[PDB]
Amino acid sequence: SVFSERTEESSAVQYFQFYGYLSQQQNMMQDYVRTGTYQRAILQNHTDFKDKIVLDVGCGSGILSFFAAQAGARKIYAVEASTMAQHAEVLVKSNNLTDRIVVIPGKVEEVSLPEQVDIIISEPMGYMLFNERMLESYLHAKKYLKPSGNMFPTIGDVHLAPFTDEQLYMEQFTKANFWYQPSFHGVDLSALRGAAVDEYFRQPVVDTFDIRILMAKSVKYTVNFLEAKEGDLHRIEIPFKFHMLHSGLVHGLAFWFDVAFIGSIMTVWLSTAPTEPLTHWYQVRCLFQSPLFAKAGDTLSGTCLLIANKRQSYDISIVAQVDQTGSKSSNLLDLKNPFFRYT
Amino acid sequence: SVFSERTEESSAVQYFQFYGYLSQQQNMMQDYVRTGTYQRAILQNHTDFKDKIVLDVGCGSGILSFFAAQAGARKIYAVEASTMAQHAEVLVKSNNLTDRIVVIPGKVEEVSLPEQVDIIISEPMGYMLFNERMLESYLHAKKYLKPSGNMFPTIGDVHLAPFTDEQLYMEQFTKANFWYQPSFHGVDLSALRGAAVDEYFRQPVVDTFDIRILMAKSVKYTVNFLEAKEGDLHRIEIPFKFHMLHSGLVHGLAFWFDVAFIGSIMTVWLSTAPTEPLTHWYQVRCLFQSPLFAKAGDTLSGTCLLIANKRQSYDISIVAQVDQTGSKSSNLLDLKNPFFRYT
Amino acid sequence: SVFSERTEESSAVQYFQFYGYLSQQQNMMQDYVRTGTYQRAILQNHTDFKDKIVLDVGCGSGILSFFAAQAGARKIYAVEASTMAQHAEVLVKSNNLTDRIVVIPGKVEEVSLPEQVDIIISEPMGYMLFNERMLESYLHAKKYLKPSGNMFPTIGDVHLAPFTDEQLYMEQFTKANFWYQPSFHGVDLSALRGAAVDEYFRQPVVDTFDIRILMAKSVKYTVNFLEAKEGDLHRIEIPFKFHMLHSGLVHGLAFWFDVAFIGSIMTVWLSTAPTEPLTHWYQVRCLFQSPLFAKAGDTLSGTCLLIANKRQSYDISIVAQVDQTGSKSSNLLDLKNPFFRYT
Amino acid sequence: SVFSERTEESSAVQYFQFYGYLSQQQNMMQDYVRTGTYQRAILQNHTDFKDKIVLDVGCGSGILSFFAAQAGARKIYAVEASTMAQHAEVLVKSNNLTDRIVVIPGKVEEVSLPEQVDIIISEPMGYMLFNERMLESYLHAKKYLKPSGNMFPTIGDVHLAPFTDEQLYMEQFTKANFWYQPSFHGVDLSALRGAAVDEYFRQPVVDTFDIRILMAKSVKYTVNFLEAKEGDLHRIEIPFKFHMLHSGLVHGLAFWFDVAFIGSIMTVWLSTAPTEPLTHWYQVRCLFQSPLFAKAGDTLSGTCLLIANKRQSYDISIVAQVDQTGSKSSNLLDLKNPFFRYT
Numbered sequence A, B, C, D: 001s002v003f004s005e006r007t008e009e010s011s012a013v014q015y016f017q018f019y020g021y022l023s024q025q026q027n028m029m030q031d032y033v034r035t036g037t038y039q040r041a042i043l044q045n046h047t048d049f050k051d052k053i054v055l056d057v058g059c060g061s062g063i064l065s066f067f068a069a070q071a072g073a074r075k076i077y078a079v080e081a082s083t084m085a086q087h088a089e090v091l092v093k094s095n096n097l098t099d100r101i102v103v104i105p106g107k108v109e110e111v112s113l114p115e116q117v118d119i120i121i122s123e124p125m126g127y128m129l130f131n132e133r134m135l136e137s138y139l140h141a142k143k144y145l146k147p148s149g150n151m152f153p154t155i156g157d158v159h160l161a162p163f164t165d166e167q168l169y170m171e172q173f174t175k176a177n178f179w180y181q182p183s184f185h186g187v188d189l190s191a192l193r194g195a196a197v198d199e200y201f202r203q204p205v206v207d208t209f210d211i212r213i214l215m216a217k218s219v220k221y222t223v224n225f226l227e228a229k230e231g232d233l234h235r236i237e238i239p240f241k242f243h244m245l246h247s248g249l250v251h252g253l254a255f256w257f258d259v260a261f262i263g264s265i266m267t268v269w270l271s272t273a274p275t276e277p278l279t280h281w282y283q284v285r286c287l288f289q290s291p292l293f294a295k296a297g298d299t300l301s302g303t304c305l306l307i308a309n310k311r312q313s314y315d316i317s318i319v320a321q322v323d324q325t326g327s328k329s330s331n332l333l334d335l336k337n338p339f340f341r342y343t
């Protein structure tokens, strides 16, 4: 199947085991920005669900399907590959919605549905939006979508912007500095200094930050889920040209994302921007191994290249330069293994 | 091989990927108690190493082999299955010890060593001593040990003691009661409350605690690594009969471990007890499903049965009863997926 | 002459040009601890001066000779090699002491005195006591001292102690980090990163600090000016064994000095210790390129070696080792060119 | 050599020891205005460099040579007399430019070049432009320049303007009046007050200031590097006739300078004027011994005479008078020992 072909077994096992835990579902459900915004998007666009056939891709506990049911859906096919599917069925029964919500255990790439659906709902967003590669399952599910059908979310925006944060930089540099020791209990570790720096700086930093660290207005990269094909997410090339608003050191690029539910009644946005209330996605920052100096008025140009790997994540390549000086920085990051820094 | 036969591939992948990180080796190396004690044990028993042939099982960065080199070892075979083996080789070269340290990439159950050794060194201890099941590799390596050879560490003691922690016990229900509400965004979640409870109680809790919560002198179970066969660790039955020092409610059992390096000059102890400085092993607590009241002087008797599984860990079965009362409780825990509670 | 043989002319010109400025005299004179303590030492030991013959080595503006005149000295030969000598003459005349203070322009190693003296006074101390190598001129001048003669100051004590100061260390490392850049205006500087760190950490740090950064009781090295030969100061070896009072990172060694005026009436001390009021000597810290971790109770042992060079200063080699772990650090420092950090 | 004949050994040693420090190169390199404008000047005039032969006089780190290489130069001879030459070579190698950049250690007056060059680049400007007398080395290097050749920079403009700054003026006496006391620890210092005043006034003041202190449009003195000879800089006479824009007391003359890179494509300016962003040159002010009162519309006429000395600097003689009143003032200053006032 499409899923197994792009995914190492070791990763899939761990991945679906992870979402098999009720505590993780609880943690996601207790993100009230997420949950509330989804419920609002669905309910305030109740006409897009009323007497409609719905597909919930990766229903988890089934919360989105229940929202769809509240909105008047005739039938909701709720696909879930983890053992959580068993728990969702319990809730369907205890909430007396057996006539409206149908749990279908399995991977959306593998199961069979009785009919085409009018609308697809899902929450496929991970860190930096693209982590977990669930967007591909979401897009893959469009094989079940009627020609004029809709998708909630409809579009996704990735925002990137350069930042300055000396403390974070030296925080990681310090950790890498351990391997500079010429005599750790009498052992010379310095030969591994370079490998240590590489490793630590391959980690995207997941946390929040004050918006005042940003050195320029963000660049936006948009994926239209109605138009995009699964293959489109294998290799994502995001060019950027920032117009620097402040002078100083650029220590790296900050990432966040918005998704929009473009319904018939209104458009509802779910944002993880640092200007907005915090979500369980936080924000993501990719550090340069060495900061670039730029003065206001300068342009910071380059590319962020995301290559999907078989571990349900992305290999990140960031190349950036100060156009006026030719000061250039490159870094490679492993999105699957971030550094959780929050409090 | 012996290793692959007892280990699910998926688990092995994750396991050795984990130790392939310099940051994890660093985490272990920065534990001064651990590293300092190993160094001390090796060096203060220099007669056990000088001009000897040494086997380092799971050398990681190679630190223990360097210690063996400091002690005057003639030749050290350092076996490492993770990619860390490449970094160990670098340090061997940069420390001008290629003539004395030989890095062998691969699992100790699978590689071929050219000769028998005088002493085996290793750090195979995990949470509750037995987690990770690396002790079996350590014991397996004795096929390369001369009949008169030694093991560093020579013995390992696991300690069990009953504890009282009302807040820890209540915490589980406070968390699980999230599901006990009739309208979470319109959804009745209560049917899953029981499942949430069970899930939390199956998680042993990793963190430290004040020694005053302990209600009896610990019971000790000793593994002599010189005498033991790896098969002895497939099923570890630890009977206990605690003589209660204090009166109160017993909420479960606390676990920690010591290892001893029994050299020719002296015995050096490494302890992870809650009475000692904290280590990266912390301590482990397993809850009873229901607390047991015990008076000072009463006896709390039962068994802790550790059953090895193919996820490089153990299933923990605990049964305990107050002999004077007949009050009985049990629990069944999954050690592979513990809850890290330490603040 | 002895001076020219041990001194690069370039260094001497610079040196004596520096002290030819009145603003520098003002700076020294406005150190009230220095000036007041010198006056106290001389006046409260007036009997050591009353009707005696005095040599003032490096009299500068002549202040010490005036103090000696106040104490009743019969005749004072005030030797000064800089152009300040002419300003001293002006003050001697305007203060009507022409009959008692005789300025003799030139280097004490090169001038000719009319007679032997009862006591030599001077202020030959530099940073870390030994900078400027003026102590050798002081000792050299003993050729004019009667067998029963005295020296003010009589002895000098150097104190050294281990300190912790992550900020200072990071501060210097940050400066060095400039030469890690792979693309400074498109130029790769990283090949010089090693040379840059060496240079910055070659700089002793002159400033003051909180005594709470000190991690052990200081070690003392004493020079007796009455007994020492100037040859004794070409190579100064200061071994040390610190009993660590606190656990943590040792970022280097801190230095200060005391001198004692051992008169007939009383002994007067001039101290530059961080527990005492600040002087224009401040204190001096020598950083390790890599800090050493140590626990309280551990022993930090090694050697501070001072090799006199022809730039009127010393090449400093510090080697320190944590005896319990064998963690060892070496650094070389150029005392002539310190980093003045005080603000 | 020409250099050794115009320079005392002692001055030369100190001078080249100064530029032997990476931190000093760093300080100059981190002056973005300077470094950026040079890069800009070279690159935007790429036709003056593409496939051309270049001489870099005093390359230091070699940064300008790298800029020339970026512009397409065929061959660059980079001459450097300090030990920095050894570090420049390291950078040429590590930047894979050994085929195009040839580092030549030594003084430009003493080395030999294998061929003539098309263009000379250098940064020979000191305080007040002329300090350090490196302009003479720059001009001397023209012996290697084809009759076709260009100079980058091509011209230098020194600007002079009268200023009023009552507090700067009074500061001198505040400092000198330390000596005007009859009993400093029993010593009458007053006889040296005059000497202290003279000393302070002989020091040109280095720092920046508000342009509103300027009392007249600046007078400009231009050195054309294409036309000038070394000998032209031994005696520099700058007559001036200032037309006062404001009424008040003139306390001295302010100095700053511009250089222009006159290329085939465009002219680029590097300015250190007080109307422009600050550089590490700041500005320079020479005080009059006695201020001169002028009314708006009056004319302030006189001469600034710079006489080169063998300490790689100039003796400054300024004489000025208010034509309408005949009120006259002068001053002699030593540009070698300026007072760095900037805070």
Ligand SMILES: NNNCCN(CC[C@H](N)C(=O)O)C[C@H]1O[C@@H](n2cnc3c(N)ncnc32)[C@H](O)[C@@H]1O
Binding pocket: A003, A016, A019, A025, A028, A029, A057, A058, A059, A060, A061, A062, A063, A064, A079, A080, A081, A082, A084, A106, A107, A108, A109, A122, A123, A124, A125, A126, A132, A134, A137
């Ligand atoms: N933060 N995000 N990512 C999504 C989190 N959850 C949504 C939980 C639910 N929508 C809620 O809001 O409560 C993803 C869920 O979808 C499942 N999933 C992921 N890829 C799948 C696939 N190809 N086929 C079937 N199920 C799949 C996964 O097991 C997980 O349970």
Ligand SMILES: NNNCCN(CC[C@H](N)C(=O)O)C[C@H]1O[C@@H](n2cnc3c(N)ncnc32)[C@H](O)[C@@H]1O
Binding pocket: C003, C016, C019, C025, C028, C057, C058, C059, C060, C061, C062, C063, C064, C079, C080, C081, C082, C084, C106, C107, C108, C109, C122, C123, C124, C125, C126, C132, C134, C137
């Ligand atoms: N902070 N200190 N280091 C010393 C400061 N001063 C002493 C202060 C003096 N007592 C005063 O009160 O002004 C050093 C003075 O000694 C002079 N000096 C140094 N080496 C000399 C030599 N071999 N022969 C003659 N004079 C020499 C030097 O020119 C300077 O003036």
Ligand SMILES: NNNCCN(CC[C@H](N)C(=O)O)C[C@H]1O[C@@H](n2cnc3c(N)ncnc32)[C@H](O)[C@@H]1O
Binding pocket: D003, D016, D019, D025, D028, D029, D057, D058, D059, D060, D061, D062, D063, D064, D079, D080, D081, D082, D084, D106, D107, D108, D109, D122, D123, D124, D125, D126, D134, D137
């Ligand atoms: N901030 N000012 N002015 C000068 C700075 N530097 C430019 C550094 C470098 N070119 C850059 O732009 O960063 C002057 C450099 O020229 C050197 N220098 C001076 N006189 C010399 C001579 N006669 N022969 C050879 N080299 C000589 C000196 O050692 C110094 O390193």
Ligand SMILES: Nc1ncnc2c1ncn2[C@@H]1O[C@H](CSCC[C@H]([NH3+])C(=O)O)[C@@H](O)[C@H]1O
Binding pocket: B003, B016, B019, B028, B029, B057, B058, B059, B060, B061, B062, B063, B064, B079, B080, B081, B082, B084, B106, B107, B108, B109, B122, B123, B124, B134, B137
């Ligand atoms: N069967 C095995 N064969 C070889 N190496 C193993 C095996 N099981 C675990 N390891 C390695 O053993 C190490 C345990 S951590 C101990 C690392 C090092 N000796 C130190 O004390 O710092 C990890 O690096 C594992 O990859």
